[PDB]
């Protein structure tokens, strides 16, 4: 597999995220009663997307659940736009979160 992508190229991506935050232990992401889980997850992913190297355009939640062995798993799909071709390759094949040993960090990018 040799992924080559140019700057400013639209792609179709599927990614299962690990909503993990640290407080005063590691706890799952929690939203407010006036907001939907999809909005909170989209905002949380867009917060880290600058450092990752891609720009979110649209994203909807598909499967919000847990993975035992206890971890929190959320499956988000949509349309993303690559910012630069340098940081995107580093982000790929490395992970976008924690618990990478249980198959939580993985991207599948498709040309559109």
């Amino acid at each position: 597999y040799n992924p080559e992508f140019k700057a400013g190229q639209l792609l179709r991506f599927r990614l299962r995220v690990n909503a993990s935050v640290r407080r005063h232990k590691r706890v799952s992401l929690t939203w407010d009663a006036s907001s939907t889980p999809d909005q909170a997850l989209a905002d949380w992913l867009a917060a880290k997307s600058p450092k990752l190297g891609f720009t979110l355009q649209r994203c909807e939640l598909l499967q919000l659940g847990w993975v035992y062995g206890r971890f929190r798993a959320a499956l988000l799909e949509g349309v993303l736009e690559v910012d630069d071709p340098k940081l995107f390759l580093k982000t790929l094949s490395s992970g976008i979160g924690k618990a990478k040993s249980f198959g939580f960090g993985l991207l599948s990018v498709l040309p559109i």
Binding site: R14, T36, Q63
Partner: protein
């Protein structure tokens, strides 16, 4: 004597139900693979909807231990409750207090009163608790979903007689099914139309509520509203709404034994259902007592009856007007007065 409702709807994959492996559930019908939503999912989505909060008067919990210690106020009654409950027998094979309990949210006051009586023997205290939760069934949830409670005899008391703790159900629902085969998305390297069937026993429900009538009418209206305006999990009015009153149960699932293969999936499914309904009506019943139905459509989006064959009493363009007509046929039952 029975209210029969058949619904035609569409549902996006983002609001579906998945198995233990994470994939949407499927079923066979006519030798082909379809999409399946469990009936338990539908019931749970209806009892905890925004249109059924006015008629939710029961809870299913394995933590009576935290419900009892929520109204006494005095902290010094918790082991009292963890002993009275175990004297009753609500703890099961192995573990400890792992039997689901189902009583209305009005006898917890009685449970606290009985717990907080120090001049009462423990055995007769447990007996009083049994008579408390052996008649706590005056809730619309219990009269629409039923309840079973098996008391374990492994750790029973001397006598501690149990009353009738089983209530018969009044509602029959089916696993929802796809009018067609499965579909996919866009591979690398859900999206379906479903149907629905309902049945309510008015006599059984009125028996389970000690003969109350306005409560039964309110429950029927709320259940129909919730079924029409609620999505299973996640977070879309139905295209076809059918209402019938029969004395024997009839289902029309054999309308889709031929998969619908084609914006016209809805139309073809409605046509097939209409053909099956007409065929059953014209070839399985006559005389005695006829049946009368109502076709309600979103702005009459889809008409039914080959555009010439009469088979429904009237056409309704609004969901809110549908509830009143259903309650009207039983007699009276204004919607604005039963909501009180």
């Amino acid at each position: 004597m029975l209210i029969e409702i058949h619904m035609i709807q569409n549902h996006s994959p983002a609001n579906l139900n998945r198995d233990d492996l994470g994939a949407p559930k499927t079923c066979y019908f006519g030798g082909v693979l379809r999409s399946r939503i469990s009936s338990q999912c539908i019931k749970r989505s209806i009892r905890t909807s925004n249109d059924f909060k006015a008629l939710l008067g029961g809870v299913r919990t394995r933590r009576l231990a935290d419900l009892i210690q929520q109204e006494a106020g005095e902290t010094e009654c918790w082991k009292k409750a963890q002993e009275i409950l175990n004297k009753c027998g609500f703890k099961n094979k192995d573990d400890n207090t792992k039997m689901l309990v189902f009583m209305s949210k009005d006898k917890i006051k009685d449970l606290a009163r009985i717990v907080l009586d120090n001049s009462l023997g423990l055995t007769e205290a447990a007996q009083q608790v049994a008579n408390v939760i052996a008649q706590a069934t005056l809730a619309p949830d219990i009269a629409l979903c039923g309840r079973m409670l098996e008391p374990n005899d492994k750790d029973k008391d001397k006598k501690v007689k149990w009353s009738n703790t089983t209530v018969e159900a009044a509602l029959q629902v089916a696993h929802a099914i796809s009018t067609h085969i499965a579909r996919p998305e866009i591979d690398y390297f859900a999206s379906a139309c479903f149907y629905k069937y309902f049945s309510i026993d008015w006599e059984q429900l009125v028996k389970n509520l000690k003969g109350d009538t306005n409560l039964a009418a309110h429950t029927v209206g709320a259940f129909l509203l919730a079924a029409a305006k609620t999505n299973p999990s996640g977070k879309n009015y139905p295209d076809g709404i059918l209402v019938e009153f029969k004395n024997s149960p009839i289902s029309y699932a054999n309308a889709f034994v031929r998969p619908v293969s084609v914006s016209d999936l809805v139309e073809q499914s409605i046509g097939q259902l209409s053909n099956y309904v007409n065929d059953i009506r014209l070839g399985y019943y006559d005389e005695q007592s006829p049946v009368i139905g109502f076709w309600f459509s979103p702005n009459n989006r889809y008409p039914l009856g080959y555009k010439h064959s009469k088979l429904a009493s009237r056409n309704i363009g609004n969901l809110n007007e549908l509830v009143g007509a259903v309650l009207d046929y039983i007699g009276g039952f204004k919607w604005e007065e039963v909501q009180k």
